[PDB]
Amino acid sequence: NPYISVANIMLQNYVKQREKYNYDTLKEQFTFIKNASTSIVYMQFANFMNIDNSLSPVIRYQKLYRRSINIISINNINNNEATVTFESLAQNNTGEILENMLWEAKIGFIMDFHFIVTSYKLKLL
């Protein structure tokens, strides 16, 4: 629990940086995910952002919209598995909201801090 309240801080930040979209930050996002994940996590990450994907944020949002993440509740299943539930939000430089959704991020991780995300599955609510 001294370790779990820490594992929860690392778990919020991971879901934030990963599910955000600021087009001026993609290289640091990528770098962040690269250094916080296993290579299949990091890859499925990239195979989602690729412009090959119709649902990619780059295709939808481009340079106009910017996605924000609000952490709602974390479900600590065990020491290596957690479920972050959160809210998305897409608004332009005007403020007119387009997307506002409710998401579960089913995570498997390892933490001693050396935080590594070994699994990542998203679910819409």
């Binding site: 890859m43 952002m49 090959d52 780059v58």
Partner: protein
């Protein structure tokens, strides 16, 4: 390495997509990107590395 390309080319292909102006700039980035994908599945790593060098250039030019 095949993985290392997929991440690099995906990023590269994003930043080219974002900077491109008319549909004639988007068409070239979308095809290069898909070709770098098609080539990595065919296990043409030596070739995909060059189509990534073409995508990398189009990115120099667009800035």
């Amino acid at each position: 390495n095949a993985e290392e390309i997929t991440e690099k080319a995906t990023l590269v292909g994003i930043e080219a997509w974002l900077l491109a102006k008319d549909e004639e700039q988007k068409k070239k980035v979308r095809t290069l990107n898909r070709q770098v994908k098609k080539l990595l599945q065919q296990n043409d790593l030596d070739q995909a590395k060059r189509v990534l060098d073409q995508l990398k250039s189009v990115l120099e030019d667009l800035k």
